[PDB]
Amino acid sequence: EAEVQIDRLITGRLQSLQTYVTQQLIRAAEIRASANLAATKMSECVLGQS
Amino acid sequence: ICGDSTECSNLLLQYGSFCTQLNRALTGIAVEQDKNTQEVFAQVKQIYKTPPIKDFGGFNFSQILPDPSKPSKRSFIEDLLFNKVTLKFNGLTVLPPLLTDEMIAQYTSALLAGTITSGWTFGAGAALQIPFAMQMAYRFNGIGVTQNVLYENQKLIANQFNSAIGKIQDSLSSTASALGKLQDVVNQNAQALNTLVKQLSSNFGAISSVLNDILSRLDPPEAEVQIDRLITGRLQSLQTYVTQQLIRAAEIRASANLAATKMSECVLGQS
Amino acid sequence: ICGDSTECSNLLLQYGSFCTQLNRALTGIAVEQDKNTQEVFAQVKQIYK
Amino acid sequence: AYTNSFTRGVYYPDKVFRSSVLHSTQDLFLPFFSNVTWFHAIHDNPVLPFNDGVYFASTEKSNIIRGWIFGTTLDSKTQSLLIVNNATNVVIKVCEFQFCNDPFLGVVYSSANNCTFEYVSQFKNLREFVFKNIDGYFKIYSKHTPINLVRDLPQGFSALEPLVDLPIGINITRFQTLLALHAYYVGYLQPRTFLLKYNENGTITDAVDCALDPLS
Amino acid sequence: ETKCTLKSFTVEKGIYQTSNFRVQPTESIVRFPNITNLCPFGEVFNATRFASVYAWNRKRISNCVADYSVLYNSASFSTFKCYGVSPTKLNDLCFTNVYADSFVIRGDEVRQIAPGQTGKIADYNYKLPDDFTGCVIAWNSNNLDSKVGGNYNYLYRLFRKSNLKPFERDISTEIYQAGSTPCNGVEGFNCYFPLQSYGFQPTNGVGYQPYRVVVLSFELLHAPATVCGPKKSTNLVKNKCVNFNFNGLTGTGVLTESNKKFLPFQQFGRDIADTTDAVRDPQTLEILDITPCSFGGVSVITPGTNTSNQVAVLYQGVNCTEVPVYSTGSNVFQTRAGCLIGAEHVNNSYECDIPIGAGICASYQSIIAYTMSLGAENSVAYSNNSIAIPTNFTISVTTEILPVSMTKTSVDCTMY
Ligand SMILES: *[C@@H]1O[C@H](CO)[C@@H](O[C@@H]2O[C@H](CO)[C@@H](O)[C@H](O)[C@H]2NC(C)=O)[C@H](O)[C@H]1NC(C)=O
Ligand SMILES: *[C@@H]1O[C@H](CO)[C@@H](O[C@@H]2O[C@H](CO)[C@@H](O)[C@H](O)[C@H]2NC(C)=O)[C@H](O)[C@H]1NC(C)=O
Ligand SMILES: *[C@@H]1O[C@H](CO)[C@@H](O[C@@H]2O[C@H](CO)[C@@H](O)[C@H](O)[C@H]2NC(C)=O)[C@H](O)[C@H]1NC(C)=O
Ligand SMILES: *[C@@H]1O[C@H](CO)[C@@H](O[C@@H]2O[C@H](CO)[C@@H](O)[C@H](O)[C@H]2NC(C)=O)[C@H](O)[C@H]1NC(C)=O
Ligand SMILES: *[C@@H]1O[C@H](CO)[C@@H](O[C@@H]2O[C@H](CO)[C@@H](O)[C@H](O)[C@H]2NC(C)=O)[C@H](O)[C@H]1NC(C)=O
Ligand SMILES: *[C@@H]1O[C@H](CO)[C@@H](O[C@@H]2O[C@H](CO)[C@@H](O)[C@H](O)[C@H]2NC(C)=O)[C@H](O)[C@H]1NC(C)=O
Ligand SMILES: *[C@@H]1O[C@H](CO)[C@@H](O)[C@H](O)[C@H]1NC(C)=O
Ligand SMILES: *[C@@H]1O[C@H](CO)[C@@H](O)[C@H](O)[C@H]1NC(C)=O
Ligand SMILES: *[C@@H]1O[C@H](CO)[C@@H](O)[C@H](O)[C@H]1NC(C)=O
Ligand SMILES: *[C@@H]1O[C@H](CO)[C@@H](O)[C@H](O)[C@H]1NC(C)=O
Ligand SMILES: *[C@@H]1O[C@H](CO)[C@@H](O)[C@H](O)[C@H]1NC(C)=O
């Protein structure tokens, strides 16, 4: 029956970990978009005149 | 996922703090949408007014300027657009937007009056008065056509402008299905909410889809198992809905950012 | 998830309508990609030689 | 003889009111554009299999088609359901009766051993009936209003509303008709899937099959 | 509550969401069909004549709605003891059918009617099955049997070596002469009637007085239920948050009168996604309407723990007619975004500090909630022969902050 209990714990922690990973992916995509915008601004407004 | 049942809450409280993070994500996206609207529309620190008498060198802006007859102060084209498109049960709620339609109309009217009377100079300091023909002269000079052209062909340009605006008004009035994107967005949101609320009737392998029925027919020993099955199924459905909402919100944020860039570059200047 | 079985389909239809939105999402991304490439490349009205 | 049933045989499946909603259901129904066995037994009532509920129709505007006997052995050994009319009340008898060679009825009785239950209730006319049995409940629907979309043929769309439910709980396989002494269709139904469109007042106005045509 | 939810001892200026409220139910109502088709149980107990024990009378009862409570409390019975069934719950069970057994016996033979018992009549006249029987009712009958009854109208069977199986009757009257060796080695003799008559006299004792006995045998889960006990109902209430049990359909809400019309055979309507929206009560046959009771989240607007210690509380999406220390509080302000209490309303308009919604946002000058102001106001004097040219210039410096990176994390998989 310890195997039953361990199955319960494993499935619960698996859903928790999956949720964390998905949130991390979304936030990383947003930060990448912002970084691309910042790179464009630095390449355009600094090395020249806008 | 409980529907006012004590034992449901008792079995639920041991699953952690899912509700906290769900509500946090939803509040985050809601605040993001409010900020998106406020950022895209709020660009001027005054509310300009059109002069009472209008003589724009022969042009005609009557169909585009706000109409005092309508209490909503919405111009004709805005009314056509509003009339064209068209679309709290068990814990679902919809919160109203921070900005209502009236001040949106006021912002658009201020932007239009600024770009008519002043031009591009009201976006870089204080607005300056300038006659309209002497602004079209500059805007032609901007694209390589010398200003000698405009002052000798003013009537033809005015006639073409008026005819084009009449044609576009007629096209909006008659030709439908030209506003597909907004209707698609609204339909997607409504359909997602509808399927989320539909998911309740499913059985998820239990005896019945309603809690109090199985609570009044059997004893705990298998009842907690059945309630556990129902709880985990409903939690999975809710999590899926939240993830879909997050993806759609990210897409809408990207599109709104593009729209803000377009309006800030083209409206306040020349591209 | 079934592999042409009757009992599996009977037990699956009791879980709701997940597969409807799954197929909807997949078809949506397929249509989006087709529109994406068509919009990227189709930028001229005629064909010059 | 054979006939093609155009679009008849749509009934209210449950006891739920709705309004202006397209509802998709999966249940026992008569498939559209199916074959029916036109009988003209006049100057001939053979035993027909039950096979999970049957259609029934007629076109004569008088009392000649009277009763429907149901059973599994057509003998007093096993209980047989008798439904007959007396122009003033409908009497339903689920008790054991013996075989009848040439019954005559109109407005046969052999023996009533081991009786258990009794029930009492209240261009020409069409009497569309549907007889269904499920989980020990025997449901009888009816519709008694004819519409002359075309003459001499049953074309048009009509709905069926439940009139009586019986909690008898018996096994039956064979049903026969009872006549008088001196023109009814039959059709079998299958587990199909339909889409139904409701009106503003909750009346079924259109039904579309889900397994007939690619457009469907 | 804000400090609890935030789990901190300091709170900054802004609006926070703590919890949600709901309107509690008040009472319960249950309703059931107008009529109650009774059962002909009266002819059973108050019958005129009952047969002998060896030829006891059968009857079959089904499709009834009979109440045992009206019979349980009746004191006209000598004994009413049931096996395995609580009498007070008899009104809360449904059976397929019942069989009623009627006869009359002696005073002392009452105890013999029980499964797994020994006796002349318990094994030779009627045998109870080795399971639960419905139960036995017995009552005195000396006033109509020991006074006006026939002297030999009642009989029993003193016939042995023929132990009857449960629910078996032997009404065959055969003289018991074996006609073989094991009866005095003779044929014809030892011919004694298997039955015998009761010998009773007016007030002859306790164990010999006549007793009318009726046995009820139940059938459960043999078929769909047809006989059940009556269910009590009650009146209805309107415009109050109540839970209801209309004919097995249970749910909570507020009841209103409805203008819709049902066809004469539906029972309850709905709109979409299995949400009930109209029920018709069995007694009145009037169409009603269900509306979910109001509920919603609360929110607190605070100018900051550091500055002050007074807050303004806002209920979302509730018409302020029933809010219920903030029961009356201060000037209640009902807006399009709910009801705000704890703050005053002003006529002026200023910048926006703490967004609330519906175009209003409050600020701390107490706490004042006003209408959002879009900014300054001016009109430029447009004229077709006048231009404005600047004469001086200034140089300003701005700042712009942009994130470009976040912390690189990694979680161990099996260790977690
Ligand atoms: C600008 O265009 C509008 C188009 O509606 C003109 O308004 C119409 O003018 C005609 C001619 O005077 C009238 O017959 C119509 O009744 C007007 N429409 C409405 C809705 O009142 C307007 O006159 C034009 N202005 C200029 C200066 O050309
Ligand atoms: C639904 O029911 C309403 C009311 O019974 C019907 O409306 C009636 O229609 C008849 C036929 O023309 C009129 O004589 C009545 O005056 C109408 N009553 C009202 C209150 O308007 C309606 O026709 C029915 N069907 C539909 C589809 O609405
Ligand atoms: C048998 O008869 C007696 C006497 O008529 C019934 O007892 C009466 O029941 C009615 C029922 O409403 C009461 O109003 C009377 O007050 C009762 N009278 C007495 C003297 O008890 C009894 O209910 C009958 N029982 C059966 C099963 O028929
Ligand atoms: C429902 O039971 C009650 C009990 O008598 C009755 O309903 C009312 O009866 C009074 C007089 O008995 C009448 O004045 C009312 O008009 C009745 N109202 C209704 C809604 O019926 C009646 O016996 C039963 N009514 C039905 C329809 O079953
Ligand atoms: C909240 O509910 C009240 C009802 O008590 C509404 O009051 C209305 O007041 C006007 C003016 O006297 C009446 O003509 C209406 O009949 C009232 N309504 C009702 C239902 O009786 C009040 O308007 C509601 N407020 C909001 C914001 O919905
Ligand atoms: C333009 O504005 C600047 C300040 O913004 C003026 O410079 C000031 O001039 C006064 C008078 O000579 C001095 O007392 C101040 O010290 C100056 N300020 C600075 C920061 O140097 C300038 O005079 C203005 N131009 C004109 C043409 O009036
Ligand atoms: C019965 O079905 C057969 C084959 O499906 C068809 O050929 C025949 O015409 C049908 N009878 C009718 C339509 O009366
Ligand atoms: C009609 O006939 C049936 C069976 O013959 C009988 O039970 C019924 O009572 C008759 N109708 C009337 C009104 O007597
Ligand atoms: C009468 O019929 C029922 C069911 O048809 C059966 O259970 C019962 O035993 C029968 N009675 C007799 C005496 O045959
Ligand atoms: C009908 O027959 C099936 C099997 O043939 C059996 O399981 C069921 O109990 C029967 N029901 C009745 C009412 O005879
Ligand atoms: C409150 O603000 C003052 C002034 O900014 C500061 O000195 C003090 O530390 C603050 N207190 C808290 C608890 O933040």
Ligand SMILES: *[C@@H]1O[C@H](CO)[C@@H](O)[C@H](O)[C@H]1NC(C)=O
């Ligand atoms: C605002 O002014 C009007 C007109 O003087 C007055 O009726 C109203 O009460 C004022 N607002 C408040 C909150 O007192």
